[PDB]
Design an enzyme around this catalytic site. Structure first.
Site, PDB file in Angstrom:
ATOM      1  N   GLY A  44     -67.965  -5.562 -75.333  1.00  0.00           N
ATOM      2  CA  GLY A  44     -68.155  -6.108 -76.535  1.00  0.00           C
ATOM      3  C   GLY A  44     -67.756  -7.705 -76.346  1.00  0.00           C
ATOM      4  O   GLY A  44     -67.073  -7.881 -75.050  1.00  0.00           O
ATOM      5  N   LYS A  47     -65.646 -13.997 -80.845  1.00  0.00           N
ATOM      6  CA  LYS A  47     -65.783 -15.341 -80.752  1.00  0.00           C
ATOM      7  C   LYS A  47     -64.499 -16.026 -79.873  1.00  0.00           C
ATOM      8  O   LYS A  47     -64.827 -17.042 -79.086  1.00  0.00           O
ATOM      9  CB  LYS A  47     -65.622 -16.093 -82.027  1.00  0.00           C
ATOM     10  CG  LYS A  47     -65.254 -17.457 -82.122  1.00  0.00           C
ATOM     11  CD  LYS A  47     -65.197 -18.059 -83.364  1.00  0.00           C
ATOM     12  CE  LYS A  47     -63.917 -18.866 -83.844  1.00  0.00           C
ATOM     13  NZ  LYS A  47     -64.054 -20.235 -84.566  1.00  0.00           N
ATOM     14  N   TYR A  48     -63.588 -15.256 -79.637  1.00  0.00           N
ATOM     15  CA  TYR A  48     -62.454 -15.474 -78.433  1.00  0.00           C
ATOM     16  C   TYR A  48     -62.335 -14.794 -77.203  1.00  0.00           C
ATOM     17  O   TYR A  48     -61.342 -15.111 -76.606  1.00  0.00           O
ATOM     18  CB  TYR A  48     -61.341 -15.559 -79.275  1.00  0.00           C
ATOM     19  CG  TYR A  48     -60.887 -16.253 -80.767  1.00  0.00           C
ATOM     20  CD1 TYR A  48     -61.152 -17.658 -80.633  1.00  0.00           C
ATOM     21  CD2 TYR A  48     -61.026 -15.640 -81.967  1.00  0.00           C
ATOM     22  CE1 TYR A  48     -60.840 -18.379 -81.698  1.00  0.00           C
ATOM     23  CE2 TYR A  48     -60.987 -16.462 -83.196  1.00  0.00           C
ATOM     24  CZ  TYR A  48     -60.899 -17.660 -83.029  1.00  0.00           C
ATOM     25  OH  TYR A  48     -60.834 -18.530 -84.219  1.00  0.00           O
ATOM     26  N   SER A  49     -63.338 -13.852 -77.260  1.00  0.00           N
ATOM     27  CA  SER A  49     -63.021 -12.853 -75.803  1.00  0.00           C
ATOM     28  C   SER A  49     -64.287 -12.213 -75.441  1.00  0.00           C
ATOM     29  O   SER A  49     -64.995 -11.907 -76.324  1.00  0.00           O
ATOM     30  CB  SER A  49     -61.674 -11.905 -75.882  1.00  0.00           C
ATOM     31  OG  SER A  49     -61.885 -11.065 -76.830  1.00  0.00           O
ATOM     32  N   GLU A  50     -64.163 -11.565 -74.102  1.00  0.00           N
ATOM     33  CA  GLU A  50     -65.071 -10.593 -73.894  1.00  0.00           C
ATOM     34  C   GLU A  50     -64.376  -9.387 -73.314  1.00  0.00           C
ATOM     35  O   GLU A  50     -63.235  -9.686 -72.686  1.00  0.00           O
ATOM     36  CB  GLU A  50     -66.002 -11.357 -72.780  1.00  0.00           C
ATOM     37  CG  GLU A  50     -67.069 -11.885 -73.163  1.00  0.00           C
ATOM     38  CD  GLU A  50     -68.371 -11.968 -71.962  1.00  0.00           C
ATOM     39  OE1 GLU A  50     -68.097 -11.778 -70.760  1.00  0.00           O
ATOM     40  OE2 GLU A  50     -69.544 -12.113 -72.662  1.00  0.00           O
ATOM     41  N   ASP A 154     -54.943  -8.736 -89.271  1.00  0.00           N
ATOM     42  CA  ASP A 154     -56.293  -8.470 -88.926  1.00  0.00           C
ATOM     43  C   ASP A 154     -56.582  -6.982 -88.941  1.00  0.00           C
ATOM     44  O   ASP A 154     -57.209  -6.516 -88.168  1.00  0.00           O
ATOM     45  CB  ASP A 154     -56.944  -9.213 -87.632  1.00  0.00           C
ATOM     46  CG  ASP A 154     -58.486  -9.193 -87.509  1.00  0.00           C
ATOM     47  OD1 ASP A 154     -59.111  -9.213 -88.677  1.00  0.00           O
ATOM     48  OD2 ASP A 154     -58.869  -9.134 -86.545  1.00  0.00           O
TER      49      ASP A 154
HETATM   50  C1  LIG Z   1     -62.382  -1.387 -77.050  1.00  0.00           C
HETATM   51  O1  LIG Z   1     -61.652  -0.149 -76.354  1.00  0.00           O
HETATM   52  C2  LIG Z   1     -60.491  -0.860 -75.938  1.00  0.00           C
HETATM   53  C3  LIG Z   1     -59.791  -2.009 -76.643  1.00  0.00           C
HETATM   54  C4  LIG Z   1     -58.601  -2.141 -76.309  1.00  0.00           C
HETATM   55  C5  LIG Z   1     -57.933  -3.666 -76.897  1.00  0.00           C
HETATM   56  C6  LIG Z   1     -58.299  -4.557 -77.535  1.00  0.00           C
HETATM   57  S1  LIG Z   1     -59.874  -5.160 -77.581  1.00  0.00           S
HETATM   58  C7  LIG Z   1     -59.876  -6.923 -78.311  1.00  0.00           C
HETATM   59  O2  LIG Z   1     -60.723  -7.579 -78.471  1.00  0.00           O
HETATM   60  N1  LIG Z   1     -58.355  -6.952 -78.641  1.00  0.00           N
HETATM   61  C8  LIG Z   1     -57.520  -5.764 -78.114  1.00  0.00           C
HETATM   62  O3  LIG Z   1     -56.221  -5.849 -77.903  1.00  0.00           O
HETATM   63  C9  LIG Z   1     -57.556  -1.547 -75.782  1.00  0.00           C
HETATM   64  C10 LIG Z   1     -57.885  -0.353 -75.234  1.00  0.00           C
HETATM   65  C11 LIG Z   1     -59.467   0.108 -75.557  1.00  0.00           C
HETATM   66  O4  LIG Z   1     -59.986   1.430 -74.886  1.00  0.00           O
END
Ligand SMILES: COc1cc(/C=C2\SC(=O)NC2=O)ccc1O
EC number: 2.7.11.1
Length: 328
Positions: A44, A47-50, A154
């Protein structure tokens, strides 16, 4: 001007912590070895990360890598410091590492992988018992971070990762989280529209941990009533009208009057006059298996205009709604 406000709990945690704890602008990032992680697939992009699924080649374990899009160093250090402060807490996502990505030239956060169940699958199949169980698991995370001086800001379904096979829950995306300092005025441009608290919608900046409890209430209402999202506004103004059609306009005016707040005059034409509704209005044959008197009373006690009147996370865990949930 507006009347000031303070949190009714955990008010002074950050004052009595060493300054290192909350002064995230002074944090010195400890960098891992970027070649430990091989990206596998894109998951995914915000707007602030990939966000990527990756593999840690020093243990062949799955991880997730969040490569931050160029944003100011304080917002990067804020998220990093909060994740480090909260690490190991109940149901807080674990930051395993931080590396410098050579392509983006920004920090890439490395998280424990959560084998999460499809979110739509989760919404459609969670039982009455499941909803109570996972609400309790979210409350453990929120009481923890509030007790640690931090508000998430959030809370929404997509930031609550659920590995339903192991009944494991993790609260993720701390990128909007902040340290709570009594008397501080905060940006109201936080949270997804459907989960924004009344305080944000009326431009009241001196808010606190209780913002997360409104968002949690919005999630609960969507789950027990089978309407996602529950308050479905077309913009931030219609969002408050949607709330006022349920909670009523007279208690909205009581709220802003208590804090000596003035509504945006653009509401004069759209707000109307609305009675407060009884929650039984939203029960029907397709959701009644998720509704109980305990659920409605608990929801009622989360969804208050006055942020000072909402249940705290700890109080919420005391509620009879959770009596049926097996404790470990
Ligand atoms: C999308 O699967 C995961 C995401 C995350 C954490 C994220 S994703 C994001 O945008 N900000 C976070 O802390 C951790 C384990 C996962 O399996």
């Amino acid at each position: 001007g507006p009347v000031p406000s303070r949190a009714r709990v955990y008010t002074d945690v950050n004052t009595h912590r060493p300054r290192e704890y909350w002064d995230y602008e002074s944090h010195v990032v400890e960098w891992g070895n970027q070649d430990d992680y091989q990206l596998v697939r894109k998951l995914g992009r915000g707007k602030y990360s990939e966000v990527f699924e990756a593999i840690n080649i020093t243990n062949n374990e799955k991880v997730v890598v969040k490569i931050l899009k160029p944003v100011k160093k304080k917002k990067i250090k804020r998220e990093i410091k909060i994740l480090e402060n909260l690490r190991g807490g109940p149901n807080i996502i674990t930051l395993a590492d931080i590396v410098k990505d050579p392509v983006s030239r920004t920090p890439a956060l490395v998280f424990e992988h959560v084998n999460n169940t499809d979110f739509k699958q989760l919404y459609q199949t969670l039982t009455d018992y499941d909803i109570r169980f996972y609400m309790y698991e979210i409350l453990k995370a929120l009481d923890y971070c509030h007790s640690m001086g931090i508000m998430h800001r959030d809370v929404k379904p997509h930031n609550v990762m659920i590995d339903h096979e192991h009944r494991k829950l993790r609260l993720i995306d701390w990128g909007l989280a902040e340290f709570y300092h009594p008397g501080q005025e905060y940006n109201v441009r936080v949270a997804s529209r459907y989960f924004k608290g009344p305080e944000l919608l009326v431009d009241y900046q001196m808010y606190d941990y209780s913002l997360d409890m409104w968002s949690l209430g919005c999630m609960l209402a969507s789950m027990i009533f089978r309407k996602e999202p529950f308050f479905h506004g077309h913009d931030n103004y219609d969002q408050l009208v949607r709330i006022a059609k349920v909670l009523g306009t007279e208690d909205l005016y009581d709220y802003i009057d208590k804090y000596n707040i003035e509504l945006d005059p653009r509401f004069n034409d759209i707000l109307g006059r609305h009675s407060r509704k009884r929650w039984e209005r939203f029960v029907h044959s397709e959701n009644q298996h998720l509704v109980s008197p305990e659920a409605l009373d608990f929801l009622d006690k989360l969804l208050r205009y006055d942020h000072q009147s909402r249940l705290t996370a700890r109080e919420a865990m005391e509620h009879p709604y959770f009596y049926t949930v097996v404790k470990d």
